[PDB]
Amino acid sequence: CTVGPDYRTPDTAAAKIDATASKPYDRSRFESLWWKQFDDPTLNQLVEQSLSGNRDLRVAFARLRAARALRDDVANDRFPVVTSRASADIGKGQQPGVTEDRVNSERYDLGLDSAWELDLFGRIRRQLESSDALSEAAEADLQQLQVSLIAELVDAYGQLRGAQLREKIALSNLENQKESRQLTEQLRDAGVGAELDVLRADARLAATAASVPQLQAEAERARHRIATLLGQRPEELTVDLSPRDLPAITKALPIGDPGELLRRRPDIRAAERRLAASTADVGVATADLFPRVSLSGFLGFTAGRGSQIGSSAARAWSVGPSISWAAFDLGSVRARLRGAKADADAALASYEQQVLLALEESANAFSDYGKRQERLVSLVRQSEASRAAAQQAAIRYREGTTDFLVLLDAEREQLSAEDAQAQAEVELYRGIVAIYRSLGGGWQ
Amino acid sequence: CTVGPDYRTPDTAAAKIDATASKPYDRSRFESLWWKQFDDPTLNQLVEQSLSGNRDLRVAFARLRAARALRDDVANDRFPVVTSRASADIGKGQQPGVTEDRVNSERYDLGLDSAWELDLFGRIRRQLESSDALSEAAEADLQQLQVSLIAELVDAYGQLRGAQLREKIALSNLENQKESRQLTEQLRDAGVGAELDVLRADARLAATAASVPQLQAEAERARHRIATLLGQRPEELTVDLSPRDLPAITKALPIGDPGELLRRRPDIRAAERRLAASTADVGVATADLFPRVSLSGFLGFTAGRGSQIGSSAARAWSVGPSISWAAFDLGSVRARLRGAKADADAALASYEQQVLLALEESANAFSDYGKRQERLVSLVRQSEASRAAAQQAAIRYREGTTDFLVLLDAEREQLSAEDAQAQAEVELYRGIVAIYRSLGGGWQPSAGSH
Amino acid sequence: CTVGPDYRTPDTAAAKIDATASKPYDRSRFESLWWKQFDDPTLNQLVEQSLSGNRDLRVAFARLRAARALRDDVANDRFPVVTSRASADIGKGQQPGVTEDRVNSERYDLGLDSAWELDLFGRIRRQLESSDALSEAAEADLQQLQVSLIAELVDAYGQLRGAQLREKIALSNLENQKESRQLTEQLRDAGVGAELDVLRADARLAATAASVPQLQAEAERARHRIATLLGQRPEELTVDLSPRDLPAITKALPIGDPGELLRRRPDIRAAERRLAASTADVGVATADLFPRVSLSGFLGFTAGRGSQIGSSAARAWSVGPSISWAAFDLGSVRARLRGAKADADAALASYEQQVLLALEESANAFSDYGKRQERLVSLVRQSEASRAAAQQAAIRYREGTTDFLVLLDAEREQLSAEDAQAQAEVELYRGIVAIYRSLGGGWQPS
Numbered sequence A: 001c002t003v004g005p006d007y008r009t010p011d012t013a014a015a016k017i018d019a020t021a022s023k024p025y026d027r028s029r030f031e032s033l034w035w036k037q038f039d040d041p042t043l044n045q046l047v048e049q050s051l052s053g054n055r056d057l058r059v060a061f062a063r064l065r066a067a068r069a070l071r072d073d074v075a076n077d078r079f080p081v082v083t084s085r086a087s088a089d090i091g092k093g094q095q096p097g098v099t100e101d102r103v104n105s106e107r108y109d110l111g112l113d114s115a116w117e118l119d120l121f122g123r124i125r126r127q128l129e130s131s132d133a134l135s136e137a138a139e140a141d142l143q144q145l146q147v148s149l150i151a152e153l154v155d156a157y158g159q160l161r162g163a164q165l166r167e168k169i170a171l172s173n174l175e176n177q178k179e180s181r182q183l184t185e186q187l188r189d190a191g192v193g194a195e196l197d198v199l200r201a202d203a204r205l206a207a208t209a210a211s212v213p214q215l216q217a218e219a220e221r222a223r224h225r226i227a228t229l230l231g232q233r234p235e236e237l238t239v240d241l242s243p244r245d246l247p248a249i250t251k252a253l254p255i256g257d258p259g260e261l262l263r264r265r266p267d268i269r270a271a272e273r274r275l276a277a278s279t280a281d282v283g284v285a286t287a288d289l290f291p292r293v294s295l296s297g298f299l300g301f302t303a304g305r306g307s308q309i310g311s312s313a314a315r316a317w318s319v320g321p322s323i324s325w326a327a328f329d330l331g332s333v334r335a336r337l338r339g340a341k342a343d344a345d346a347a348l349a350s351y352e353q354q355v356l357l358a359l360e361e362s363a364n365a366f367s368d369y370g371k372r373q374e375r376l377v378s379l380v381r382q383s384e385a386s387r388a389a390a391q392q393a394a395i396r397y398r399e400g401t402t403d404f405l406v407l408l409d410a411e412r413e414q415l416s417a418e419d420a421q422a423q424a425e426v427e428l429y430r431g432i433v434a435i436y437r438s439l440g441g442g443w444q
Numbered sequence B: 001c002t003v004g005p006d007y008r009t010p011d012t013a014a015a016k017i018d019a020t021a022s023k024p025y026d027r028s029r030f031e032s033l034w035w036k037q038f039d040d041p042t043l044n045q046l047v048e049q050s051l052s053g054n055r056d057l058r059v060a061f062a063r064l065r066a067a068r069a070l071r072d073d074v075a076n077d078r079f080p081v082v083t084s085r086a087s088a089d090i091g092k093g094q095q096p097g098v099t100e101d102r103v104n105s106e107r108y109d110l111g112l113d114s115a116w117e118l119d120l121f122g123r124i125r126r127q128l129e130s131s132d133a134l135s136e137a138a139e140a141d142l143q144q145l146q147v148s149l150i151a152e153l154v155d156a157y158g159q160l161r162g163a164q165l166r167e168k169i170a171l172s173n174l175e176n177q178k179e180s181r182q183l184t185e186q187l188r189d190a191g192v193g194a195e196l197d198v199l200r201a202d203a204r205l206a207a208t209a210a211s212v213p214q215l216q217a218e219a220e221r222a223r224h225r226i227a228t229l230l231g232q233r234p235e236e237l238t239v240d241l242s243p244r245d246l247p248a249i250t251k252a253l254p255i256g257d258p259g260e261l262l263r264r265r266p267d268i269r270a271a272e273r274r275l276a277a278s279t280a281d282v283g284v285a286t287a288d289l290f291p292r293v294s295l296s297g298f299l300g301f302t303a304g305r306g307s308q309i310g311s312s313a314a315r316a317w318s319v320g321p322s323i324s325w326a327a328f329d330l331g332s333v334r335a336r337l338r339g340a341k342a343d344a345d346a347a348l349a350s351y352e353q354q355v356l357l358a359l360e361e362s363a364n365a366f367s368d369y370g371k372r373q374e375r376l377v378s379l380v381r382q383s384e385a386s387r388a389a390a391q392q393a394a395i396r397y398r399e400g401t402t403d404f405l406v407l408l409d410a411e412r413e414q415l416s417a418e419d420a421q422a423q424a425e426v427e428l429y430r431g432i433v434a435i436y437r438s439l440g441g442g443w444q445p446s447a448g449s450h
Numbered sequence C: 001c002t003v004g005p006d007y008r009t010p011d012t013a014a015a016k017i018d019a020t021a022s023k024p025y026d027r028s029r030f031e032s033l034w035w036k037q038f039d040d041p042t043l044n045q046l047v048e049q050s051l052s053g054n055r056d057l058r059v060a061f062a063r064l065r066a067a068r069a070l071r072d073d074v075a076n077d078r079f080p081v082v083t084s085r086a087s088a089d090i091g092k093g094q095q096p097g098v099t100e101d102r103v104n105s106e107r108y109d110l111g112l113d114s115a116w117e118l119d120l121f122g123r124i125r126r127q128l129e130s131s132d133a134l135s136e137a138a139e140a141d142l143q144q145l146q147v148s149l150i151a152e153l154v155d156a157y158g159q160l161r162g163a164q165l166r167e168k169i170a171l172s173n174l175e176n177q178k179e180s181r182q183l184t185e186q187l188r189d190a191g192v193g194a195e196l197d198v199l200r201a202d203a204r205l206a207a208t209a210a211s212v213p214q215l216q217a218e219a220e221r222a223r224h225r226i227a228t229l230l231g232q233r234p235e236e237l238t239v240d241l242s243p244r245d246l247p248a249i250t251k252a253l254p255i256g257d258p259g260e261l262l263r264r265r266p267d268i269r270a271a272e273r274r275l276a277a278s279t280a281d282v283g284v285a286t287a288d289l290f291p292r293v294s295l296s297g298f299l300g301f302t303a304g305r306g307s308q309i310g311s312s313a314a315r316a317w318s319v320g321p322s323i324s325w326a327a328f329d330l331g332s333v334r335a336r337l338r339g340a341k342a343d344a345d346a347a348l349a350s351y352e353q354q355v356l357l358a359l360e361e362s363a364n365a366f367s368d369y370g371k372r373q374e375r376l377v378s379l380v381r382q383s384e385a386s387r388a389a390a391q392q393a394a395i396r397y398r399e400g401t402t403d404f405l406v407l408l409d410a411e412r413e414q415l416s417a418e419d420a421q422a423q424a425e426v427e428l429y430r431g432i433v434a435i436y437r438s439l440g441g442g443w444q445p446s
Ligand SMILES: CCCCCCCCO[C@@H]1O[C@H](CO)[C@@H](O)[C@H](O)[C@H]1O
Pocket: A003, A004, A005, A006, A279, A282, A286, A341, A344
């Protein structure tokens, strides 16, 4: 028989996210290769190269092989273990109870030794159950690393495109501000301007100019992150990352049934498999409450004279049945069993915490995405109005019917609005990534 | 003998925090349930719910159970370990020393086997001292998690109230800016305005409007964090978290004597107990320099014929006193003892680092709190002057004695000042949390074991 | 024999950082005491005190000692292990084979017990090779912690200087803003001003005043970080941290050949030593495919009567040669060997990851530093233009027919620019730190 608890997966309720019933989302299908929806072949090539090259993923694959090797070793314990031996014991001395003379003694043995734990209460079965669950946990850990890797990479690519977009914006605004700085100098030098206007124009041109190397530094840091995520050195990136627009998804997002997310996410499965392994380990400990039945054997040759080894006259066999039971040391056995029970309770609570964290992450991703869409509508309006204002202010300054501060402020506001809108477009992109990461998108 | 060093807790000096003698603080009392002084029943409910629901606290209690179980196994080594066995050896072959004929041979044994390490140099006593200290470490780890959980929860609630407060401010400013934008449109349509005024007002309104969903998103993140902290799913949070004012404490903070903080913090006790355990482990290794004295026994039956087991003619007993000593392998013993001494040294330095980190955290919390109060005084003044300016600019713009940019700039400044003051009020709240977390308040004493 | 793979350090290509063939850098030598280039004696004394007092460094040295002790234990397995014993076995019962009567039995033994694994396939030598490499990894971990600690400390000191500089700038700007507010109130009181000017000036003053305690709190946080990094309590710091200018390095930075950084970095060596150890462990597992040859021994006394112990009549010796082989359990041995190989594949992939992270760190540090220099050029210009604008705006506001907003906006821009420039100066200093951290600076080879 097999003693100890018989594991049953927790009866975990499906995820419920009411917001997913609204129009930004499509619950009728889930895209597993979710990043392909951006229709960006550069991004797709990055992801393919990362899955082949990423070194953390290679570590995880190796850990899975290591777990399977451990399970394979334990699985042999279900059967007799038959090893081989040639040994002797040779000496001279008294033989207490036989003689007080110092006598020569010799014994020689050559043969097969067998050790067999008969698995009557399932200690070994439970060890294998545990090892098998831990191999499945390691597979789930690998899948989770793929989910996390793909999301990190797709996210970094967005950050790269964002920095490139923000640089383009900064440079376009810098050109507008260089044009008005030129105009302040021309009006000043024709006697219808002011040194104060030029100085203010110079200060704001320099502020804008200072943003450009900061954005370039951010783009470079993103490129270097991408290289490492691909398993590549910074100078050896294969994929051309010259500027392109930030990608977008204009269809409703195919998110499937949010109720499936806890079954899809590999981190949840890994934690469930760790729980299953810990539950089996309670059974391993439980079996020690019961007797241990074992059977040793020897087959081969035994002799007092080494010259006879291998002959018919020295053939020998032996069997060694044994039953052991903790008896008065059952207290120690019970202590170990309490320890296994505690470990299993820790694994259950840890599994439950992983569920809660997954539900938090998904709730956050959906809440953030809806709000990022809303925020973008306002920022687009802000940018449109700010451009029109700056255009009108420039006409009026040139024509002498407004003061330079009106134009300066309008230019400041145009840049601020256009850069905020860009950052919000990046946030939307990153929000898509956060949704698919939370849903357990992307693994093999 | 119980060999090896006798552990003595480090003579660590009391924390000294000079700033605590000032008017913001009350050293005459300490409040263990420190969050109650916010007089916020919703907060109190959240904390109490968290203590029964939080899953990380369940892990930590399980880890404590596990440490006790390890101790209980060690504790039994102080006595004879008496197990039971029924065994045989059955075979056919030569019997070296007895005969060279291949003969049948049988031996049967049935009885109690006893194994006993006489603990003459206290090796087992030191092992139990270590296990007992590690159980205490695990109790302190749970208490430190309670401290950390409560501070994190109270802080998250502040962040929620802050996002709600900032939303209210954004919407109040948005209303003012809608009125201004309407006025620009009216003046334009009267032929006494300008399209430039309207466009600038439209841009400002949209900027303020864009802030609202960002603040709403922050509030939802805070709500979801609170749910997990309570051990609840996001959609099953019961507690009504509809907006309320950010809580405040207007009496001097009851912080007790800062000299008690190192003794109160469970993280410092956890590290001290690990030090104690490591020092006991030096004693375990020191015992192996000395001989190990043991006594085995058998009581039951032994026979050559399985048929005689259980008969008086098969009764048997034996005792096996034994002394062993490492002798020429003392070099290995000494290597293990160097290893144990190095581990104890690591535990001591770790302990001292935890002390320093605790003193850093408390120093930071007190310095931050006094500066946050000072900061808020100036921001309150900024907000007041900024509202007066925006009101007067709006009057002047409507009458035609100031240009729109003067109004626009004043509206910008009003929002900037009000929002800054709200962030500073949240920082003050968070600063109170940081003070209490650093003082090690709020944990439940353990019943322990007997 | 010593079986299993014979470890060879990976043939990892040298780092290539093209941008270091530029003007801000001196590739002709590397300054190992890299922080001394700031010519800041207070900083220098912080570093020395940290090396003396930092408790994390103490933990790491203790871990190194523990790894060496482990190794020393393993090394004794190469020889016979000879222990000592005094024992007796006394009882009453049958003696299967010998007799069916219940007879009294007494036996006494006193001597040396020897156990010896003959290391014919190198199992034990592979164990020692592993343990030796893990002790070298512990040493590299300690050296990496020192690199990291020194960088963290130097960085924290720059942050402290930054907060003190920004506080100075805030207070200077506050003074200018108080003067402007006085003028608003005078102009109002002389009937050529406006209450609206005064209110806006008061709001501005309050805003700048609010920044001061925030910057002071940042400076105190940095002080307290510094104390811990020194191994000191916050109120006991032994180094005077009263305000001083942020340090600067005007000569080209001595960075050596960037191609050497992977050999200098202790984290890379620690990962390489863990890969060497895991490679040895494959050998340990490999050795179990082969027979294990052992020899036990006893030398001493054996008697039936206790009084004979130690006498020539009770002299006794024995030897126990043995050879064992897994035979039908070779499948278990093979499983363990697959596991060891997997563990060594993980170590190799971990080592390569550590190389990529180092190359990323160094690429980021050099890219950032060049761009931080460029950015500071623009910000210096911004500050200069902003100060001149604010002075001219104050002249114009006094000339008495311009709205205060022109002055207010110029004063906001002056403070914004000066503060931004200071932050950028801090970022340049922190960028130097990041460069040297990324190159493996801060530990000294013996
Ligand atoms: C992790 C929670 C552990 C609770 C253990 C309950 C499950 C079964 O455990 C065991 O199976 C044996 C069957 O003969 C019984 O004899 C044991 O005494 C019983 O407790």
